[PDB]
């Protein structure tokens, strides 16, 4: 199995208490059911099937970004050792099964409102003693810490063993073909979130390879022509919502295996991530892997927020680090198209349009986040949109770097 | 086979709000011809409803030709109709008369009916056959061919002859927004996975309908998975192979998380009667199966033979041989059950049958009691009972009292107390715990017995069972684990031969070595004859030397069978840690909880008093045990694994094992909805987001819960159809208000464990919730105006508009000189011609000629008065009154502005139907919107709402080239973003405010392979 | 994970013998060491903790031992909070016995039942469970400022309490005094108040003390 | 209580040794006992008085509330781990070092400001 | 007694009588589980006893609430519409003398 | 208690029939006559001794 | 309205009230 996880809470963006409403606690972690492996029950085959627009949570990622804040205020055990309680709320039992109003006669010591508290699955001697049971809380704090170490888009991880796909990993994928990127992260997430599965387990390879192929596609390389072992993701033609992704085992030239171990931490860099069901289901999925395998190594420090420096066990700076790249959906897709255009996939006059098509699309998932941003302030104690300042949108982050990290990953 | 009917495809376009054309446009031919055109004259059905008034009423599946019904639906009849019958699903039935709707329990119903609106929409959107368009209407396009349902789907394909108000609208429709968009197909030549297409369908039904596909996923597993889940389940033995090749798509919802499972295991233990009788068809179930498959042949002859062959002089009266030969004979039902009982010790722990104890009137010189007591010992470890050790110790300690005295704890428990009567943990011989205490020079024999039981009682151990990818139903043991009495060994794939090693075997060898010592002891040696006493040593050695194959079995093959058989079983194993002689960790009670000790102030009170304690014990007989235990033979040429790989083939080839796996999911839902349903209609309970707090609810009494919590249990029982008891039992103690699960045993010492299974993170505690967010926003579409109701005698001639009221409402509450009605609503009369004062709120009778604010409730226990003093007043046009009722049901009545009419009687009647019980749906008269500029008769109206409750008007004059006197209401574009907005982007929907009756949506083509559809077993 | 149902699982973190083992004591409990039958699980702890203590006692700089400590360690089915079970109390004391602490009472080279029992008795006696080094399930926090040098792997974290009172150094064993040794009294600074320094005496004094006269 | 505030560095159990001066990016929070607030209030009170002259002459910067330099931390507050263990204070009012700096240089800067006018008034 | 509160889960488990009915059943559950009981009470039947006494305790009776919120308002009234008013000497719990 | 239960309406309907029977005033009347028959009885027997 | 149906069920698994009314009217 795996008995060791290190987390880091969200950052109260220049704000007092944790940016989550009581109305939220009873909107995700409520109903008394275990708020744990629920993160995914708020996503659809796409975006047009969710209440992710003008509403309490105006974003295809506004849910997790909230449930994640709510998790910070109720994770004191892993911080210090005791259970504590934040505003009349504290886990019912030592197993942290769920949340519930403070008892009445034996209330837990009121939590201490502190931002960015590190976490150690050791500071809580009961966790590992029950592992199996509260297994979920692990993979979750992990999903958290991969969004917390970042400020503008979750930071997942990518791999590619120098070997060919693990047979029973080409068989497991060939049964997930038609399935959309959403339902893939689904199985991915749903999987590594119940019963400690050994990192050796088949599924981990499969769901870890499904996070390497998704990336190759997101950067042309692993396209309809140059597939992985036979797979690649086909994105919906921009003009009718290109924010899609479906796995498709083809049979064109197989992108030869890399010359070595290709590891790197990639995170969406522009606010765009917050509303692209594919930029989340994908990233979220790549995180399903890390959750049941500790954490490859230390994520490079360089490009990362101010509250994520030398974050013990997580962030690094020295050798045990892996350069962390951050791409921008538009500056990205543009090259993703150029790649297609080069492999004869499309016409030479069709990419100067494919971009128009998609670029206008990104301009739509832009006047929307800004609207929701200047709709749900932040001083309002809530953070469904997560501040971003009308700027990062164009921000041509690493991008160019990851577009190269994709080629070396699928030579 | 009672598994919830999960997969339920629907071809017909998913939508649940039809534009039901109401008040029809008058076909007029004599005069003013041409004003209104009917698609009918061009033998071509109109896409949009064509009538003088077209309401958007809601009917789940109105246009759902897709094969197979869901069972239950909710179709409100247009406002013109009554409607109240659709809201009396609870707190009404036999109390509030037909005509009315219980306004007090309004939320409890608009919620119980919305849950109803959801389950009815839990179908998968199956893909149809999209053909091109050879006709010029769409020139080639991919419209999805259906019969007449086509016209109604794509509104864009409409042919417009004249500038009719509809054609006014449709005209806009963006040409390219029709047919399909992205058929994503893989295997060239095989059916497309999921095609994607814009087609008339409300963002809401769509949402639910697709938060369902999201669910069917939450319980799916690719093939390379479902194969292992199956392998592991039979311990890899059992040859099944999966074909490595791309299988297009296969949605096979057979799996539930480990959590969804437990929520139904405890759930299943609630309905099970704690009595021993309800746990008997739980062990016997595992026992008929245990035998069904087992390489262990029981064969008396073996033993009989081994014993019959000990010499015994017949110049003796007592027949050492003839004795056991009798005793050891009462069938094997006892051996198995002992085992099978291990699988469910939580529920029922076996016990030595009281009758099978040497009776307390004889000492050990009695030879039939010496054998009786030997057979208590051997069979000791077999029974799961937390006392067998002590009872066994006593049985002898007891029988040899005169010679051997020992310490016996509590008063009223002498060393000669009928052994069996030693069930409590606290009454264990002080010497028995710590044998150090029993002195040799006084109780040698007995001390060597205590000394023996401690050194040789079987060490408990645990093994795996079931697949780790498919959770498990464990409440006190790690997932996929089963505690077990005897030390355990891995199944052998070679040849077995009764071995003399192993706890079992050793236990028989040392114990039979003890009673051989009891027989050659001082006591025995002096009394019992000599030559006879030899026979007894022989009669025992024989036993302790029979080549019994069982000792082996209970340690190698049995564990495999329990593990593999712990899946085929119709109820998952329910175990509590086996405690090998540990004073304090004896489990006195394995309890469960229907209610939570949180809500009722029970946080401190002891566990034994807040939870129920399963009390089910089986009376196993020592005779049977031994005869079996000590006499099992197999098939000389046998491969243990092989014989199983054979014995499991069947009960592992079909996906019956996968069924319970869903009954679990449907349970985790039914429960999470009930918890929500009751708590919403309740008032602040388990933190359940109540998006329906505005609506009313004055009945929070348990009855109200059980009633609520009951329909919900129907809606599901009806929706998925499943006879099996689901969500039942939670009630039992008559109180849903605090439904809460929790299991938890209690070891004598102190430790109480506790393990309260909370509902897993469910998919409908969203959907329903999601519907209530949106219901609130668009009530009208269900016949449920909000705001209040005004009663002012406005006698106009213009476009009277009860629903959407122009301008500010006259006199709001708390306005200048606008007195309320004091709770009672009483009217005090005044002498010699003085106005009858209406007791106002502050409790200071005021006068009727003014502006009143009638707190609805008041108006219910008061009408008899209202109608007799304030009513005659309102008509006179001198006392505008605001009846202040939260959210009412609202009947419309379109009259004709041409002719004269006085809305007084269609109101006076409504008043005469208001009991202190229930009020009829507020009726509002509304002129039918005309085409020309007609001369109108001055009508007198009184009822008109403040809030804009005109939200389902949809259209004002479909066919008419233009409405003239009525209120023109051009088909609102805001409703059809997908259909007419340039900026609309395929994949966006203001889902919690409006309901876009025309979106895009992925229709699938899921294939549901069976277990043979996946792997090839056999 | 698989043997999590078993009573408890002791494991040697410091250089296991033939490779990392994972001792699992059977459920039964031994008779003899305590009036209250001590579980085989907890007895193994005492027997080892009583080594890390006796070993620290005479471990020297010049000598090289197999393991820098002999104390066992509970890894499963162990209650970390309370301090009742002999095991919990013993465990709690081993997290301290890994620092080099030595028992004032010389622990015999060949522990005898009389002796083991006199230790398992001293352990049960009401006291304060050492709190400097908190307990972990996969890591033994060892004082950085302590003689003990961590092996290698991921089992030893160099945790430093806020204020550990122990300093280092050893103690040369001295033979048992053949007769009651008189002790000259040298005073300290703080002084107790007659009132308090009275009952203090009267709470632990041998009042009706029988005494021999001898010959004056 | 008095002195700097300490908190259990070893967490939960405070043993008189676990406690350590809760220092950090702001310096060390020293407790503001009842009487010591009398002074800083009496000092600020004598400055607020000159409010009408601060606005008139566009200097100053609004009234100086002593509640702008303090905080509401909680822990054990003493002079040394040993004795700080006997002063468990909850949500006491402490002023961090860097703050004990401003309340100082503010009362000093403002003190000049008024000391001048206050001389003319006289 | 107390003014009839809006029915809920609170007033319906917190009544004076609810406590009494509760804590008593609670107390007897420990009595039928005494070591002494062993003498004549079977291990199975001793559990069946805890089984029944717990059913009673947890049963959702709504009288405890009536006898503490709704029953006073009846006697208060009923005690006025009677041709013979209520003769009533003061109540006393354990105050002995 | 009965499923639908508005304490207000219930107790109301019940105590209605009670105040209809002027049994409350019979009490005041039988009372002022017992006080007459007493101040008169006590007197007549207190005048003969 | 007094009625042991619920009580009976609850108990039965694991296995006019003048007295009462003549106890309140008794107070």
JSON list of C-alpha atoms in Angstrom, two decimals, chain A residues 93-237:
[
{"chain": "A", "resi": 93, "resn": "UNK", "atom": "CA", "xyz": [-15.01, 10.85, 15.33]},
{"chain": "A", "resi": 94, "resn": "UNK", "atom": "CA", "xyz": [-11.21, 10.17, 15.27]},
{"chain": "A", "resi": 95, "resn": "UNK", "atom": "CA", "xyz": [-11.56, 8.61, 11.81]},
{"chain": "A", "resi": 96, "resn": "UNK", "atom": "CA", "xyz": [-12.63, 12.00, 10.41]},
{"chain": "A", "resi": 97, "resn": "UNK", "atom": "CA", "xyz": [-15.50, 10.24, 8.62]},
{"chain": "A", "resi": 98, "resn": "UNK", "atom": "CA", "xyz": [-17.41, 13.53, 8.19]},
{"chain": "A", "resi": 99, "resn": "UNK", "atom": "CA", "xyz": [-18.19, 16.95, 9.65]},
{"chain": "A", "resi": 100, "resn": "UNK", "atom": "CA", "xyz": [-20.91, 17.84, 12.17]},
{"chain": "A", "resi": 101, "resn": "UNK", "atom": "CA", "xyz": [-21.91, 20.61, 14.63]},
{"chain": "A", "resi": 102, "resn": "UNK", "atom": "CA", "xyz": [-19.74, 20.76, 17.75]},
{"chain": "A", "resi": 103, "resn": "UNK", "atom": "CA", "xyz": [-21.21, 18.37, 20.39]},
{"chain": "A", "resi": 104, "resn": "UNK", "atom": "CA", "xyz": [-22.42, 20.37, 23.41]},
{"chain": "A", "resi": 105, "resn": "UNK", "atom": "CA", "xyz": [-20.67, 19.20, 26.58]},
{"chain": "A", "resi": 106, "resn": "UNK", "atom": "CA", "xyz": [-17.40, 17.80, 25.19]},
{"chain": "A", "resi": 107, "resn": "UNK", "atom": "CA", "xyz": [-16.49, 20.26, 22.39]},
{"chain": "A", "resi": 108, "resn": "UNK", "atom": "CA", "xyz": [-13.10, 20.05, 20.62]},
{"chain": "A", "resi": 109, "resn": "UNK", "atom": "CA", "xyz": [-10.70, 22.97, 21.23]},
{"chain": "A", "resi": 110, "resn": "UNK", "atom": "CA", "xyz": [-11.68, 25.73, 18.77]},
{"chain": "A", "resi": 111, "resn": "UNK", "atom": "CA", "xyz": [-9.33, 25.55, 15.75]},
{"chain": "A", "resi": 112, "resn": "UNK", "atom": "CA", "xyz": [-6.64, 28.18, 15.31]},
{"chain": "A", "resi": 113, "resn": "UNK", "atom": "CA", "xyz": [-7.23, 30.20, 12.15]},
{"chain": "A", "resi": 114, "resn": "UNK", "atom": "CA", "xyz": [-3.80, 29.92, 10.46]},
{"chain": "A", "resi": 115, "resn": "UNK", "atom": "CA", "xyz": [-3.07, 29.91, 6.72]},
{"chain": "A", "resi": 116, "resn": "UNK", "atom": "CA", "xyz": [-0.88, 27.46, 4.77]},
{"chain": "A", "resi": 117, "resn": "UNK", "atom": "CA", "xyz": [-0.37, 24.89, 7.52]},
{"chain": "A", "resi": 118, "resn": "UNK", "atom": "CA", "xyz": [1.78, 21.95, 6.45]},
{"chain": "A", "resi": 119, "resn": "UNK", "atom": "CA", "xyz": [0.51, 18.44, 7.10]},
{"chain": "A", "resi": 120, "resn": "UNK", "atom": "CA", "xyz": [2.08, 15.11, 8.04]},
{"chain": "A", "resi": 121, "resn": "UNK", "atom": "CA", "xyz": [0.13, 11.84, 7.90]},
{"chain": "A", "resi": 122, "resn": "UNK", "atom": "CA", "xyz": [2.31, 11.07, 10.93]},
{"chain": "A", "resi": 123, "resn": "UNK", "atom": "CA", "xyz": [1.24, 13.90, 13.25]},
{"chain": "A", "resi": 124, "resn": "UNK", "atom": "CA", "xyz": [-1.87, 11.77, 13.59]},
{"chain": "A", "resi": 125, "resn": "UNK", "atom": "CA", "xyz": [-0.86, 8.33, 15.01]},
{"chain": "A", "resi": 126, "resn": "UNK", "atom": "CA", "xyz": [-4.41, 7.01, 14.41]},
{"chain": "A", "resi": 127, "resn": "UNK", "atom": "CA", "xyz": [-4.46, 7.63, 10.67]},
{"chain": "A", "resi": 128, "resn": "UNK", "atom": "CA", "xyz": [-1.92, 4.97, 9.71]},
{"chain": "A", "resi": 129, "resn": "UNK", "atom": "CA", "xyz": [-3.22, 2.63, 12.43]},
{"chain": "A", "resi": 130, "resn": "UNK", "atom": "CA", "xyz": [-6.47, 2.51, 10.45]},
{"chain": "A", "resi": 131, "resn": "UNK", "atom": "CA", "xyz": [-5.06, 3.28, 6.98]},
{"chain": "A", "resi": 132, "resn": "UNK", "atom": "CA", "xyz": [-7.57, 1.12, 5.11]},
{"chain": "A", "resi": 133, "resn": "UNK", "atom": "CA", "xyz": [-10.63, 2.90, 6.56]},
{"chain": "A", "resi": 134, "resn": "UNK", "atom": "CA", "xyz": [-9.68, 6.57, 6.30]},
{"chain": "A", "resi": 135, "resn": "UNK", "atom": "CA", "xyz": [-7.59, 5.78, 3.22]},
{"chain": "A", "resi": 136, "resn": "UNK", "atom": "CA", "xyz": [-9.55, 8.43, 1.22]},
{"chain": "A", "resi": 137, "resn": "UNK", "atom": "CA", "xyz": [-8.49, 11.39, 3.39]},
{"chain": "A", "resi": 138, "resn": "UNK", "atom": "CA", "xyz": [-5.01, 10.70, 2.00]},
{"chain": "A", "resi": 139, "resn": "UNK", "atom": "CA", "xyz": [-5.69, 10.96, -1.72]},
{"chain": "A", "resi": 140, "resn": "UNK", "atom": "CA", "xyz": [-7.80, 14.04, -0.92]},
{"chain": "A", "resi": 141, "resn": "UNK", "atom": "CA", "xyz": [-5.33, 16.05, 1.14]},
{"chain": "A", "resi": 142, "resn": "UNK", "atom": "CA", "xyz": [-3.15, 15.23, -1.86]},
{"chain": "A", "resi": 143, "resn": "UNK", "atom": "CA", "xyz": [-5.62, 16.69, -4.37]},
{"chain": "A", "resi": 144, "resn": "UNK", "atom": "CA", "xyz": [-5.65, 19.71, -2.09]},
{"chain": "A", "resi": 145, "resn": "UNK", "atom": "CA", "xyz": [-1.87, 20.15, -1.75]},
{"chain": "A", "resi": 146, "resn": "UNK", "atom": "CA", "xyz": [-1.55, 20.00, -5.54]},
{"chain": "A", "resi": 147, "resn": "UNK", "atom": "CA", "xyz": [-3.83, 22.98, -5.93]},
{"chain": "A", "resi": 148, "resn": "UNK", "atom": "CA", "xyz": [-2.49, 24.76, -2.85]},
{"chain": "A", "resi": 149, "resn": "UNK", "atom": "CA", "xyz": [1.18, 24.65, -3.84]},
{"chain": "A", "resi": 150, "resn": "UNK", "atom": "CA", "xyz": [-0.13, 26.58, -6.83]},
{"chain": "A", "resi": 151, "resn": "UNK", "atom": "CA", "xyz": [-2.08, 29.82, -7.16]},
{"chain": "A", "resi": 152, "resn": "UNK", "atom": "CA", "xyz": [-3.12, 29.77, -10.80]},
{"chain": "A", "resi": 153, "resn": "UNK", "atom": "CA", "xyz": [-3.90, 26.17, -11.77]},
{"chain": "A", "resi": 154, "resn": "UNK", "atom": "CA", "xyz": [-3.18, 22.77, -10.08]},
{"chain": "A", "resi": 155, "resn": "UNK", "atom": "CA", "xyz": [0.29, 21.23, -10.36]},
{"chain": "A", "resi": 156, "resn": "UNK", "atom": "CA", "xyz": [0.19, 17.56, -11.42]},
{"chain": "A", "resi": 157, "resn": "UNK", "atom": "CA", "xyz": [2.99, 15.20, -12.55]},
{"chain": "A", "resi": 158, "resn": "UNK", "atom": "CA", "xyz": [4.02, 13.43, -15.77]},
{"chain": "A", "resi": 159, "resn": "UNK", "atom": "CA", "xyz": [5.94, 10.23, -16.54]},
{"chain": "A", "resi": 160, "resn": "UNK", "atom": "CA", "xyz": [6.94, 7.75, -19.26]},
{"chain": "A", "resi": 161, "resn": "UNK", "atom": "CA", "xyz": [8.92, 4.63, -18.36]},
{"chain": "A", "resi": 162, "resn": "UNK", "atom": "CA", "xyz": [11.54, 3.91, -21.03]},
{"chain": "A", "resi": 163, "resn": "UNK", "atom": "CA", "xyz": [9.62, 0.64, -21.61]},
{"chain": "A", "resi": 164, "resn": "UNK", "atom": "CA", "xyz": [6.53, -0.10, -23.77]},
{"chain": "A", "resi": 165, "resn": "UNK", "atom": "CA", "xyz": [3.04, 0.14, -22.23]},
{"chain": "A", "resi": 166, "resn": "UNK", "atom": "CA", "xyz": [2.59, -2.59, -19.52]},
{"chain": "A", "resi": 167, "resn": "UNK", "atom": "CA", "xyz": [0.44, -4.95, -21.67]},
{"chain": "A", "resi": 168, "resn": "UNK", "atom": "CA", "xyz": [-2.37, -5.15, -19.08]},
{"chain": "A", "resi": 169, "resn": "UNK", "atom": "CA", "xyz": [-2.18, -1.35, -19.48]},
{"chain": "A", "resi": 170, "resn": "UNK", "atom": "CA", "xyz": [-2.87, -1.42, -23.20]},
{"chain": "A", "resi": 171, "resn": "UNK", "atom": "CA", "xyz": [-5.75, -3.79, -22.45]},
{"chain": "A", "resi": 172, "resn": "UNK", "atom": "CA", "xyz": [-7.19, -1.62, -19.68]},
{"chain": "A", "resi": 173, "resn": "UNK", "atom": "CA", "xyz": [-7.09, 1.48, -21.89]},
{"chain": "A", "resi": 174, "resn": "UNK", "atom": "CA", "xyz": [-8.57, -0.22, -24.94]},
{"chain": "A", "resi": 175, "resn": "UNK", "atom": "CA", "xyz": [-11.73, -0.55, -22.85]},
{"chain": "A", "resi": 176, "resn": "UNK", "atom": "CA", "xyz": [-11.89, 3.20, -22.19]},
{"chain": "A", "resi": 177, "resn": "UNK", "atom": "CA", "xyz": [-11.71, 4.38, -25.80]},
{"chain": "A", "resi": 178, "resn": "UNK", "atom": "CA", "xyz": [-14.93, 6.29, -26.55]},
{"chain": "A", "resi": 179, "resn": "UNK", "atom": "CA", "xyz": [-14.95, 7.53, -22.94]},
{"chain": "A", "resi": 180, "resn": "UNK", "atom": "CA", "xyz": [-14.52, 11.36, -22.48]},
{"chain": "A", "resi": 181, "resn": "UNK", "atom": "CA", "xyz": [-11.59, 12.92, -20.55]},
{"chain": "A", "resi": 182, "resn": "UNK", "atom": "CA", "xyz": [-14.10, 13.62, -17.77]},
{"chain": "A", "resi": 183, "resn": "UNK", "atom": "CA", "xyz": [-15.19, 10.02, -17.15]},
{"chain": "A", "resi": 184, "resn": "UNK", "atom": "CA", "xyz": [-11.52, 9.00, -17.41]},
{"chain": "A", "resi": 185, "resn": "UNK", "atom": "CA", "xyz": [-10.39, 11.15, -14.51]},
{"chain": "A", "resi": 186, "resn": "UNK", "atom": "CA", "xyz": [-13.60, 9.72, -13.03]},
{"chain": "A", "resi": 187, "resn": "UNK", "atom": "CA", "xyz": [-12.35, 6.14, -12.96]},
{"chain": "A", "resi": 188, "resn": "UNK", "atom": "CA", "xyz": [-8.91, 7.57, -12.21]},
{"chain": "A", "resi": 189, "resn": "UNK", "atom": "CA", "xyz": [-10.08, 9.53, -9.16]},
{"chain": "A", "resi": 190, "resn": "UNK", "atom": "CA", "xyz": [-12.78, 7.05, -8.03]},
{"chain": "A", "resi": 191, "resn": "UNK", "atom": "CA", "xyz": [-10.05, 4.38, -8.18]},
{"chain": "A", "resi": 192, "resn": "UNK", "atom": "CA", "xyz": [-7.19, 5.78, -6.08]},
{"chain": "A", "resi": 193, "resn": "UNK", "atom": "CA", "xyz": [-9.79, 6.87, -3.50]},
{"chain": "A", "resi": 194, "resn": "UNK", "atom": "CA", "xyz": [-10.78, 3.77, -1.47]},
{"chain": "A", "resi": 195, "resn": "UNK", "atom": "CA", "xyz": [-8.77, 0.82, -0.09]},
{"chain": "A", "resi": 196, "resn": "UNK", "atom": "CA", "xyz": [-4.98, 1.44, -0.11]},
{"chain": "A", "resi": 197, "resn": "UNK", "atom": "CA", "xyz": [-3.90, 0.13, -3.51]},
{"chain": "A", "resi": 198, "resn": "UNK", "atom": "CA", "xyz": [-0.24, -0.83, -3.94]},
{"chain": "A", "resi": 199, "resn": "UNK", "atom": "CA", "xyz": [1.55, 1.51, -6.38]},
{"chain": "A", "resi": 200, "resn": "UNK", "atom": "CA", "xyz": [2.39, -1.80, -8.08]},
{"chain": "A", "resi": 201, "resn": "UNK", "atom": "CA", "xyz": [-1.29, -2.40, -8.88]},
{"chain": "A", "resi": 202, "resn": "UNK", "atom": "CA", "xyz": [-2.13, -2.54, -12.59]},
{"chain": "A", "resi": 203, "resn": "UNK", "atom": "CA", "xyz": [-4.50, 0.43, -12.52]},
{"chain": "A", "resi": 204, "resn": "UNK", "atom": "CA", "xyz": [-1.81, 2.89, -11.37]},
{"chain": "A", "resi": 205, "resn": "UNK", "atom": "CA", "xyz": [0.28, 2.24, -14.48]},
{"chain": "A", "resi": 206, "resn": "UNK", "atom": "CA", "xyz": [-2.77, 2.49, -16.73]},
{"chain": "A", "resi": 207, "resn": "UNK", "atom": "CA", "xyz": [-4.12, 5.67, -15.09]},
{"chain": "A", "resi": 208, "resn": "UNK", "atom": "CA", "xyz": [-0.57, 7.05, -15.01]},
{"chain": "A", "resi": 209, "resn": "UNK", "atom": "CA", "xyz": [-0.11, 6.36, -18.72]},
{"chain": "A", "resi": 210, "resn": "UNK", "atom": "CA", "xyz": [-3.51, 7.94, -19.37]},
{"chain": "A", "resi": 211, "resn": "UNK", "atom": "CA", "xyz": [-2.10, 11.13, -17.85]},
{"chain": "A", "resi": 212, "resn": "UNK", "atom": "CA", "xyz": [0.97, 11.01, -20.08]},
{"chain": "A", "resi": 213, "resn": "UNK", "atom": "CA", "xyz": [-1.01, 10.50, -23.30]},
{"chain": "A", "resi": 214, "resn": "UNK", "atom": "CA", "xyz": [-3.49, 13.25, -22.41]},
{"chain": "A", "resi": 215, "resn": "UNK", "atom": "CA", "xyz": [-0.53, 15.62, -22.18]},
{"chain": "A", "resi": 216, "resn": "UNK", "atom": "CA", "xyz": [0.99, 14.53, -25.48]},
{"chain": "A", "resi": 217, "resn": "UNK", "atom": "CA", "xyz": [-2.35, 15.32, -27.12]},
{"chain": "A", "resi": 218, "resn": "UNK", "atom": "CA", "xyz": [-2.67, 18.66, -25.33]},
{"chain": "A", "resi": 219, "resn": "UNK", "atom": "CA", "xyz": [0.52, 19.56, -27.18]},
{"chain": "A", "resi": 220, "resn": "UNK", "atom": "CA", "xyz": [-0.14, 18.13, -30.64]},
{"chain": "A", "resi": 221, "resn": "UNK", "atom": "CA", "xyz": [2.67, 15.51, -30.54]},
{"chain": "A", "resi": 222, "resn": "UNK", "atom": "CA", "xyz": [0.45, 12.60, -29.50]},
{"chain": "A", "resi": 223, "resn": "UNK", "atom": "CA", "xyz": [-2.08, 13.34, -32.24]},
{"chain": "A", "resi": 224, "resn": "UNK", "atom": "CA", "xyz": [-4.37, 11.36, -34.53]},
{"chain": "A", "resi": 225, "resn": "UNK", "atom": "CA", "xyz": [-1.24, 10.54, -36.54]},
{"chain": "A", "resi": 226, "resn": "UNK", "atom": "CA", "xyz": [1.53, 10.11, -33.95]},
{"chain": "A", "resi": 227, "resn": "UNK", "atom": "CA", "xyz": [-0.14, 8.00, -31.24]},
{"chain": "A", "resi": 228, "resn": "UNK", "atom": "CA", "xyz": [1.42, 6.59, -28.07]},
{"chain": "A", "resi": 229, "resn": "UNK", "atom": "CA", "xyz": [1.14, 2.80, -28.01]},
{"chain": "A", "resi": 230, "resn": "UNK", "atom": "CA", "xyz": [-1.88, 3.39, -30.20]},
{"chain": "A", "resi": 231, "resn": "UNK", "atom": "CA", "xyz": [-3.72, 6.06, -28.23]},
{"chain": "A", "resi": 232, "resn": "UNK", "atom": "CA", "xyz": [-4.04, 9.84, -28.37]},
{"chain": "A", "resi": 233, "resn": "UNK", "atom": "CA", "xyz": [-6.79, 12.31, -27.46]},
{"chain": "A", "resi": 234, "resn": "UNK", "atom": "CA", "xyz": [-8.90, 13.99, -30.14]},
{"chain": "A", "resi": 235, "resn": "UNK", "atom": "CA", "xyz": [-10.09, 17.44, -29.07]},
{"chain": "A", "resi": 236, "resn": "UNK", "atom": "CA", "xyz": [-13.44, 18.79, -30.26]},
{"chain": "A", "resi": 237, "resn": "UNK", "atom": "CA", "xyz": [-13.16, 21.15, -33.23]}
]
